[PDB]
Amino acid sequence: AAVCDICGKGPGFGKSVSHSHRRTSRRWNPNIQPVRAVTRPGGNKQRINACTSCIKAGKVSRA
RNA sequence: GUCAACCGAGCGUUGAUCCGAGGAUGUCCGAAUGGGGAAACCCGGCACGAGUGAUGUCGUGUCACCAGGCGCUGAAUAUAUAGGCGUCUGGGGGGAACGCGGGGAAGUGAAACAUCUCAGUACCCGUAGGAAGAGAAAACAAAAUGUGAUUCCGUGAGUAGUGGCGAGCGAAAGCGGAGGAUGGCUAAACCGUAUGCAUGUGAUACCGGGUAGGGGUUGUGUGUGCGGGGUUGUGGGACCUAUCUUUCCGGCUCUACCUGGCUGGAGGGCAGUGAGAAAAUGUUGUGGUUAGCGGAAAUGGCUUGGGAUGGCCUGCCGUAGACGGUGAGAGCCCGGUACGUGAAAACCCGACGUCUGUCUUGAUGGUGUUCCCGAGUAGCAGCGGGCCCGUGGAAUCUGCUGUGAAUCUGCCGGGACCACCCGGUAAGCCUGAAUACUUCCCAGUGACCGAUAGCGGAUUAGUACCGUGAGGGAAUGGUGAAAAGUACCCCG
RNA sequence: UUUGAAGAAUGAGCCUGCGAGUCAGGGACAUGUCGCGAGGUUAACCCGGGUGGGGUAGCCGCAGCGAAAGCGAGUCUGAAUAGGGCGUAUCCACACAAGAGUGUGUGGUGUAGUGGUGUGUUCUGGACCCGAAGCGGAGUGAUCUACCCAUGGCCAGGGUGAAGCGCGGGUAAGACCGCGUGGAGGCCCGAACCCACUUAGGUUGAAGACUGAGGGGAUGAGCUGUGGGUAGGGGUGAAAGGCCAAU
RNA sequence: UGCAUCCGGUGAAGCCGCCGAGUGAUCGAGUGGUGGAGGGUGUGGGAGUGAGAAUGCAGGCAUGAGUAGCGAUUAGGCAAGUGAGAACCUUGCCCGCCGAAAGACCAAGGGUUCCUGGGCCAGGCCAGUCCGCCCAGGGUGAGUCGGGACCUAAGGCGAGGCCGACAGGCGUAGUCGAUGGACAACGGGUUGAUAUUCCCGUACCCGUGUAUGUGCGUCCAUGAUGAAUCAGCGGUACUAACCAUCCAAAACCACCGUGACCGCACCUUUCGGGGUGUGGCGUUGGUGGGGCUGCAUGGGACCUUCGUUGGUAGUAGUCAAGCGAUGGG
RNA sequence: AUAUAUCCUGAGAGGUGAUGCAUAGCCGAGUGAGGCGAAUUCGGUGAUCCUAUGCUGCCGAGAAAAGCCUCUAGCGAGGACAUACACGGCCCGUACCCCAAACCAACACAGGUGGUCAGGUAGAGAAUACUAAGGCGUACGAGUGAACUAUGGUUAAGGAACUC
RNA sequence: CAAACCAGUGAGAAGCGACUGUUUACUAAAAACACAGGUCCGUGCGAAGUCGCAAGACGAUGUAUACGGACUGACGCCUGCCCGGUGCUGGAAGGUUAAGAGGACCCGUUAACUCCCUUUGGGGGUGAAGCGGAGAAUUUAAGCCCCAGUAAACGGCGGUGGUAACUAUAACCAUCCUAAGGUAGCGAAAUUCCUUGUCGGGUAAGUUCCGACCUGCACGAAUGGCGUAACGACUUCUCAACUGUCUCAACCAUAGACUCGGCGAAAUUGCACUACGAGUAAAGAUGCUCGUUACGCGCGGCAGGACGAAAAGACCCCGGGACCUUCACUACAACUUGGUAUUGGUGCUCGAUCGUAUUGGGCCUCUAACCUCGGACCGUAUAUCCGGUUCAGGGACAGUGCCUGGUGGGU
RNA sequence: GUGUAAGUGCACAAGGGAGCUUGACUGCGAGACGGACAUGUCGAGCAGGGACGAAAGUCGGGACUAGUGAUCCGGCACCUCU
Ligand SMILES: [Mg+2]
Ligand SMILES: [Mg+2]
Ligand SMILES: [Mg+2]
Ligand SMILES: [Mg+2]
Ligand SMILES: [Mg+2]
Ligand SMILES: [Mg+2]
Ligand SMILES: [Mg+2]
Ligand SMILES: [Mg+2]
Ligand SMILES: [Mg+2]
Ligand SMILES: [Mg+2]
Ligand SMILES: [Mg+2]
Ligand SMILES: [Mg+2]
Ligand SMILES: [Mg+2]
Ligand SMILES: [Mg+2]
Ligand SMILES: [Mg+2]
Ligand SMILES: [Mg+2]
Ligand SMILES: [Mg+2]
Ligand SMILES: [Mg+2]
Ligand SMILES: [Mg+2]
Ligand SMILES: [Mg+2]
Ligand SMILES: [Mg+2]
Ligand SMILES: [Mg+2]
Ligand SMILES: [Mg+2]
Ligand SMILES: [Mg+2]
Ligand SMILES: [Mg+2]
Ligand SMILES: [Mg+2]
Ligand SMILES: [Mg+2]
Ligand SMILES: [Mg+2]
Ligand SMILES: [Mg+2]
Ligand SMILES: [Mg+2]
Ligand SMILES: [Mg+2]
Ligand SMILES: [Mg+2]
Ligand SMILES: [Mg+2]
Ligand SMILES: [Mg+2]
Ligand SMILES: [Mg+2]
Ligand SMILES: [Mg+2]
Ligand SMILES: [Mg+2]
Ligand SMILES: [Mg+2]
Ligand SMILES: [Mg+2]
Ligand SMILES: [Mg+2]
Ligand SMILES: [Mg+2]
Ligand SMILES: [Mg+2]
Ligand SMILES: [Mg+2]
Ligand SMILES: [Mg+2]
Ligand SMILES: [Mg+2]
Ligand SMILES: [Mg+2]
Ligand SMILES: [Mg+2]
Ligand SMILES: [Mg+2]
Ligand SMILES: [Mg+2]
Ligand SMILES: [Mg+2]
Ligand SMILES: [Mg+2]
Ligand SMILES: [Mg+2]
Ligand SMILES: [Mg+2]
Ligand SMILES: [Mg+2]
Ligand SMILES: [Mg+2]
Ligand SMILES: [Mg+2]
Ligand SMILES: [Mg+2]
Ligand SMILES: [Mg+2]
Ligand SMILES: [Mg+2]
Ligand SMILES: [Mg+2]
Ligand SMILES: [Mg+2]
Ligand SMILES: [Mg+2]
Ligand SMILES: [Mg+2]
Ligand SMILES: [Mg+2]
Ligand SMILES: [Mg+2]
Ligand SMILES: [Mg+2]
Ligand SMILES: [Mg+2]
Ligand SMILES: [Mg+2]
Ligand SMILES: [Mg+2]
Ligand SMILES: [Mg+2]
Ligand SMILES: [Mg+2]
Ligand SMILES: [Mg+2]
Ligand SMILES: [Mg+2]
Ligand SMILES: [Mg+2]
Ligand SMILES: [Mg+2]
Ligand SMILES: [Mg+2]
Ligand SMILES: [Mg+2]
Ligand SMILES: [Mg+2]
Ligand SMILES: [Mg+2]
Ligand SMILES: [Mg+2]
Ligand SMILES: [Mg+2]
Ligand SMILES: [Mg+2]
Ligand SMILES: [Mg+2]
Ligand SMILES: [Mg+2]
Ligand SMILES: [Mg+2]
Ligand SMILES: [Mg+2]
Ligand SMILES: [Mg+2]
Ligand SMILES: [Mg+2]
Ligand SMILES: [Mg+2]
Ligand SMILES: [Mg+2]
Ligand SMILES: [Mg+2]
Ligand SMILES: [Mg+2]
Ligand SMILES: [Mg+2]
Ligand SMILES: [Mg+2]
Ligand SMILES: [Mg+2]
Ligand SMILES: [Mg+2]
Ligand SMILES: [Mg+2]
Ligand SMILES: [Mg+2]
Ligand SMILES: [Mg+2]
Ligand SMILES: [Mg+2]
Ligand SMILES: [Mg+2]
Ligand SMILES: [Mg+2]
Ligand SMILES: [Mg+2]
Ligand SMILES: [Mg+2]
Ligand SMILES: [Mg+2]
Ligand SMILES: [Mg+2]
Ligand SMILES: [Mg+2]
Ligand SMILES: [Mg+2]
Ligand SMILES: [Mg+2]
Ligand SMILES: [Mg+2]
Ligand SMILES: [Mg+2]
Ligand SMILES: [Mg+2]
Ligand SMILES: [Mg+2]
Ligand SMILES: [Mg+2]
Ligand SMILES: [Mg+2]
Ligand SMILES: [Mg+2]
Ligand SMILES: [Mg+2]
Ligand SMILES: [Mg+2]
Ligand SMILES: [Mg+2]
Ligand SMILES: [Mg+2]
Ligand SMILES: [Mg+2]
Ligand SMILES: [Mg+2]
Ligand SMILES: [Mg+2]
Ligand SMILES: [Mg+2]
Ligand SMILES: [Mg+2]
Ligand SMILES: [Mg+2]
Ligand SMILES: [Mg+2]
Ligand SMILES: [Mg+2]
Ligand SMILES: [Mg+2]
Ligand SMILES: [Mg+2]
Ligand SMILES: [Mg+2]
Ligand SMILES: [Mg+2]
Ligand SMILES: [Mg+2]
Ligand SMILES: [Mg+2]
Ligand SMILES: [Mg+2]
Ligand SMILES: [Mg+2]
Ligand SMILES: [Mg+2]
Ligand SMILES: [Mg+2]
Ligand SMILES: [Mg+2]
Ligand SMILES: [Mg+2]
Ligand SMILES: [Mg+2]
Ligand SMILES: [Mg+2]
Ligand SMILES: [Mg+2]
Ligand SMILES: [Mg+2]
Ligand SMILES: [Mg+2]
Ligand SMILES: [Mg+2]
Ligand SMILES: [Mg+2]
Ligand SMILES: [Mg+2]
Ligand SMILES: [Mg+2]
Ligand SMILES: [Mg+2]
Ligand SMILES: [Mg+2]
Ligand SMILES: [Mg+2]
Ligand SMILES: [Mg+2]
Ligand SMILES: [Zn+2]
């Protein structure tokens, strides 16, 4: 819940809301997961904290 | 140097001290950086010298972490990588405010109270700078054939608006001003090179007239890397086809001989320490700063007077009658005042001949047909945030999650939203001046205080003292003009 | 302060100093007063080591009515002369009506606001002065106490006598019992130590919690030195709303 | 503050009196005494502008008052000395009190309170020659005691690492961290103060080195062994069989029950269905007899698998001494 | 091999240490130092001190690491073992107080503060009573038969009738 | 003749608690706390539950004969009946409902037009495709509603009337209603208001005590009932000794109080040449009226007044705080669902334009995303952290985000 | 006796019946009453249309006095408002 490696997406802070509409401070943390992505076409794969936005950005590739 | 005096030793006409510029010296703790640690203290490794009969012993240096590179090494293992070393360059902490940015509340008002307000305030945190930040419209405007980056002022106006439509909050457009730089580029529609991965009909296919010699720019798809030149506002650029064309040379579009498309070298540019090319090449103002020099004119006389600058009388000078001191009110007494002058050396602000780059293989004006200019971006569904705007009919901005575009008969804006037309190029980038602040220094000023005031602090003050801590936190000025601070005698 | 105080209602030991309606805003209004007058005035800003000059950007009134279109000395209402609401500053003289008080038409008197300066009030600012219980953010504390963690130390003396053990009884083996040994025990009495039950004194005390007589445990859930960790809406808590540095 | 400018060392402001005047807040070019350096008419201007109170604040001084108290449970008297003064100090005599302390050593802590010398304002709840007062001087002596050179617990810090909006939080290798473990000291004497430190006498254990006497190799060579090499075997028992033991796949013989068929006699509704007894099969429920061949279960042997040597190659490469760990016990 | 075999551990006792020292006292010498200097044996009691980190017995089952000894991985042509030898071992604390007028309590305060030493007579004793060593009478005193208060002693007879 | 110091009062009846023990430092040491005994429930091991926005650590280097939570509290006899309410536990067939998808209606705009007017589309309505606005129905999980269980889970266990051989009764039947309507035991008790209930014991006298009766206002069986040996600085009561606690105080030795010398305080304080009584009055007067009495001043004592001093009254009320409780409001932490993403494939089975079509649901597989706290290597000379490699197990689950619904005095 | 309590009124009816029918109108409103204020009450006359009565005239709710709710936010219809 810290940071996504490439997108640079630090979690943002905002306030929730009731139906009565009374505020309270809360947070949002980007959807971060690690995968053993492919780096070089030689087969070397490594792990990097990536979010869904980055994944669908598809800098990381699959076989 | 001072308290503080005092002595005692002493230093000077050759110029000692005093002030300024550069330099060296700088124990230890303290980012502390050789390891450790209860700060000012313990314990080592490595390289060079020295002394002892040698050791003992001594000095000197170097020895942190992280970041970024370079060279060497390489584990699982085969390549290679992590890791491992060693070396250069940076940063590390502190500082009053200001600025940016990440986060961010309640007391309070609403006469209660949740929305709301208090307010993005205090406070915490990470950054740089002397300013920062913002900054060249994807802005406004509204038919005028208008504005023309940002920033800061005074308006516009407590108006339009927002709000349990309450308390409250609060624009924009336009106008007048300060300051100005309409300011130049990178990277995708061709090519030369360092290139590789792939393959050969390995010859009739590759060079821009004619003769001749010579022997995979992949066939097909996709992605990545390297570039001249294409970056709209009347709507705009190129795989090919109609016109003038202000130097030369070579090599290319897989070869050699007209037409077409590029790159390299000899010459007018574009400018350059720059936000749009990078690194280097060096210096003149009586400019200032750091300290300094000169700088006028009454012993004038008398009176009170302890003491005169005072009262009276003369004469005084002034480009200087700000100021302070000297025995009471001083321009004619001293420090000094206007004015003039001045730096061996160093430093901040202003030009000028070594030396450097580029380009004139590039540039300017003229007639028609056919893969580029910011993508996970604009916009979208949900969720929230900032714009006066609290979902309200809600644009514009940002963003968390899922989604997701066109590229010129493209986009987005014009305050739900649509059509004709109206106006300006988003997703890349930087860039002075106007502005804010003052821990620090200088010079001046005050209808500012004059010791319970004024900074807590005119004095050994952030001390004594209190608290183990964070922290709190005092009271305490004047003898005299000068110490001439009471010799000596007497009581005790 | 009170309806009301000589008050036995509050405050004042005394003296001296210090101590309380201030201050800002083209803020708003009214009253004084000052200049000009259908006009009044400028902000910011530029240039005079000096308050000058420039600067009309802007604001208020000269016209109001209507929510608005819009109209305009009228306008709104309304289907409307058909009067009413609001203004036409305000009045004088002439005529027309009813004399529903006044309205409707003519000729003159012709409209007074604005910017200082000082003042009361309101305005937002802490807004006449001192004063709270408390909420929130950042930090400082476990040198007492609570708990716990590691390492050490402490518990004079004197009794009680489990299991177990051996022998003798007893079994067929037992089991069971007498005898001597053994000495367990949150066992007993009682010093150090640690506590706090009663009384007394003290309660401007020797002491911000004690002194003296007695008072319980006193080999353990014990106590004690040592050094460490647990931080505030949290700790800890053999639980009382206790302790967390006399709070 | 502005001003015509003045008042004053022939005495300003301030302080304390006196006089006179205004209805008031006051005033007086109104003065007497202290004071010895600045005030200021008038007319405006601006204010931190007027104190008795707020259990106000700070300072000073009141009263209760010369009152309460002088801080234990042990307690003194006296002689003589110093001194101005002597219950309180010094010396002496007796008395009393503690004596698991009210004595003697340390740690923690404090830091000069230790000793000597001088004086007694201030401090000691009184005086005070005395003091833990002040003033000056002196005083702290370690290879062997203690803290670092050593090692570690609880726990803290922490490269890299992991996680975290920032800050930071964790925890590995490591490094810190005593209240523990590790190495050596005794008695006497000494000054006014130090002592297991100084002196005396006698010992010790750790760290470096000496070089010889023991005396030991590597650079000679003797000892114990030790193990990485060519030729086959485990009656067990690969492959046609024999003796003995229980079982049955291609149903012969015999009976019986009858999926279903052909029917022979009787019963039954008038005849029907149907039941009973039986005959021929068929079985709702396919072996025995015999040989060729091929495979499956044990026997001896044929060629390749041994009873580790026959030369060699104790010819040559190896050292243990002496110290050798970030490792093991 | 069951051997008091062997090894390890081990307070204590004897000897040397020590013909030394100290010593009660003797002499001259006074604020007090100096020289000389006798005996220096026995038994018996006896610890909470030491053997002991031991022995027995119990469950609640009672640190780590180092130093030391020892074994080897990586070397090697000079180390091992003693001793005459004169050499060589840091820095810092070391005074004083330390159940107190010196520390923590604002004081020269009837409080608290951890470890060590533990005499004699009675006694079980580390209680208690009196004493040595040694240190104190802890800083207001002098005088007065009052109340009254506090600390105490004694009390005719009655014995809880006071009083919750 | 234990002569000193030192050195247990004892016994009886009972209440509560098993006891040793701990606690409200600095007013409460108990009957409270705590425990040893049991009970219920949760907890399958990267556990349950904790601290922590995370890694991670405790739990534990433990493993259901362990750990956590809650209740009662040795031991013995026991621990009755009630599942409507609230909870918890199982069952989701039905009804209601999330987000998310979605596209019928309705609405806006505009090319063409549509009457007539000119000549080179608007003024008297339709509505083009897209654009958009509100906008559908349709798919939806948990939960709630619903069905059962559960009381050592929180909790309840009645009233009404009638009904005997003299006498008061109910020991039997009928009423309502809820789920049932208090069983054993004990009971004017630590609960009993009348109440000092009545009776008996103890005393002359007993509102306390003990022992019984039961009219239990308003006991009661794990927020446990009844007894209980021992224990207790616990509660009540009685008895013998005991005594100055008392009848009823007396004397005496001590340190103060007193006088003398020395040093030298504090609270309070508008004034002060400060009497009495009756009256008056802001309603109890040293200070007013009236009358009485009284030379000025001290010292020791005693406390009735000076509404005496100390603390801006606790109680009460009035404008406000903090903490706490809960089915008060509004939320939020945590727990829980689905969709969506980290996201892959085959086979089957189910639908709206029995032989032609509808793309998603449910299942079984598999590796390859992902997890692994399994193993074994390496970084390493030492490393249980960590990173990489291999294999092994899982595996498209899980976890994680975002939206959403539940629950939510934990905050 | 007079719709719903009491008072005030009411026979000239405000009491019944019938006929007819909508004035329980539209826009104003001279002036008043009460109101601290927001509000609340009464009312002759003027313009269109209608109702009853031939006409005269009466008709702007019930014999009167109770039967009620501010502001915001929102919903719905019409207009020669933007
Ligand atoms: Mg991150
Ligand atoms: Mg924010
Ligand atoms: Mg908020
Ligand atoms: Mg996708
Ligand atoms: Mg210099
Ligand atoms: Mg130097
Ligand atoms: Mg360091
Ligand atoms: Mg460093
Ligand atoms: Mg590098
Ligand atoms: Mg490789
Ligand atoms: Mg409010
Ligand atoms: Mg309020
Ligand atoms: Mg607020
Ligand atoms: Mg705001
Ligand atoms: Mg700079
Ligand atoms: Mg800029
Ligand atoms: Mg404006
Ligand atoms: Mg307001
Ligand atoms: Mg180009
Ligand atoms: Mg180009
Ligand atoms: Mg155009
Ligand atoms: Mg000069
Ligand atoms: Mg003179
Ligand atoms: Mg001058
Ligand atoms: Mg002068
Ligand atoms: Mg001068
Ligand atoms: Mg809004
Ligand atoms: Mg909008
Ligand atoms: Mg463009
Ligand atoms: Mg500027
Ligand atoms: Mg402090
Ligand atoms: Mg009054
Ligand atoms: Mg009065
Ligand atoms: Mg009085
Ligand atoms: Mg009063
Ligand atoms: Mg009072
Ligand atoms: Mg009052
Ligand atoms: Mg008072
Ligand atoms: Mg104003
Ligand atoms: Mg005028
Ligand atoms: Mg001007
Ligand atoms: Mg209007
Ligand atoms: Mg109208
Ligand atoms: Mg003014
Ligand atoms: Mg706070
Ligand atoms: Mg701490
Ligand atoms: Mg037994
Ligand atoms: Mg025994
Ligand atoms: Mg006893
Ligand atoms: Mg006393
Ligand atoms: Mg205190
Ligand atoms: Mg007694
Ligand atoms: Mg115990
Ligand atoms: Mg802390
Ligand atoms: Mg709290
Ligand atoms: Mg309690
Ligand atoms: Mg309580
Ligand atoms: Mg406390
Ligand atoms: Mg004079
Ligand atoms: Mg004079
Ligand atoms: Mg004078
Ligand atoms: Mg003056
Ligand atoms: Mg003036
Ligand atoms: Mg004042
Ligand atoms: Mg005063
Ligand atoms: Mg007053
Ligand atoms: Mg006062
Ligand atoms: Mg007094
Ligand atoms: Mg007295
Ligand atoms: Mg006295
Ligand atoms: Mg005392
Ligand atoms: Mg004397
Ligand atoms: Mg004694
Ligand atoms: Mg003792
Ligand atoms: Mg003793
Ligand atoms: Mg200490
Ligand atoms: Mg002296
Ligand atoms: Mg003196
Ligand atoms: Mg004194
Ligand atoms: Mg001194
Ligand atoms: Mg690190
Ligand atoms: Mg760490
Ligand atoms: Mg660690
Ligand atoms: Mg260490
Ligand atoms: Mg240590
Ligand atoms: Mg010493
Ligand atoms: Mg010593
Ligand atoms: Mg040595
Ligand atoms: Mg030292
Ligand atoms: Mg010493
Ligand atoms: Mg000492
Ligand atoms: Mg002592
Ligand atoms: Mg003190
Ligand atoms: Mg004392
Ligand atoms: Mg004390
Ligand atoms: Mg103690
Ligand atoms: Mg003892
Ligand atoms: Mg004695
Ligand atoms: Mg003694
Ligand atoms: Mg007394
Ligand atoms: Mg007697
Ligand atoms: Mg008696
Ligand atoms: Mg009982
Ligand atoms: Mg008890
Ligand atoms: Mg007990
Ligand atoms: Mg207890
Ligand atoms: Mg207690
Ligand atoms: Mg206490
Ligand atoms: Mg208490
Ligand atoms: Mg108590
Ligand atoms: Mg208990
Ligand atoms: Mg039980
Ligand atoms: Mg239980
Ligand atoms: Mg249970
Ligand atoms: Mg778990
Ligand atoms: Mg209980
Ligand atoms: Mg049931
Ligand atoms: Mg129920
Ligand atoms: Mg549809
Ligand atoms: Mg439910
Ligand atoms: Mg009873
Ligand atoms: Mg009972
Ligand atoms: Mg009772
Ligand atoms: Mg009773
Ligand atoms: Mg009774
Ligand atoms: Mg009684
Ligand atoms: Mg009862
Ligand atoms: Mg009850
Ligand atoms: Mg039960
Ligand atoms: Mg129960
Ligand atoms: Mg209960
Ligand atoms: Mg019970
Ligand atoms: Mg019992
Ligand atoms: Mg008696
Ligand atoms: Mg008496
Ligand atoms: Mg007395
Ligand atoms: Mg006395
Ligand atoms: Mg005195
Ligand atoms: Mg009176
Ligand atoms: Mg009276
Ligand atoms: Mg009186
Ligand atoms: Mg009082
Ligand atoms: Mg109060
Ligand atoms: Mg209140
Ligand atoms: Mg609170
Ligand atoms: Mg989903
Ligand atoms: Mg999926
Ligand atoms: Mg609450
Ligand atoms: Mg009628
Ligand atoms: Mg009118
Ligand atoms: Mg009506
Ligand atoms: Mg009517
Ligand atoms: Mg509203
Ligand atoms: Zn990302």
DSSP chain A: ----TTT--PPPEEEE--SS---EEEE----EEEEEEE-STTS-EEEEEEEHHHHHHT-SB--
Q: How many CB atoms lie within 10 A of CB A57?
A: 12
In the complex, which nucleotide's C1' lies nearest to the CA atom of residue A55? Answer: F342
Burial status of residue A9 (CB atoms within 10 A of its CB: 0-12, 13-18, 19 or more): middle
* Method underlying the structure: cryo-EM
CB A36 within 8 A of CB A50: no
For chain A, the farthest-separated pair of C-alpha atoms sits apart, in whole angstroms, at: 58
Question: Pick from A26, A40, A28, A35: which is nearest to A5 by CA?
Answer: A35
**Residue A30 in contact with residue A9, Cβ under 8 Å?**
yes
SS3 A55: helix
Which nucleotide is nearest, taking the CA of residue A59 and each C1'? B376
Task: Report the phi/psi class of residue A58: left, alpha or beta, with left for phi > 0 and alpha for psi in -120 to 50.
Answer: left
Resolution (A): 2.5
Picking from A31, A43, A42, A37, the residue whose alpha carbon sits closest to that of residue A3 is A31
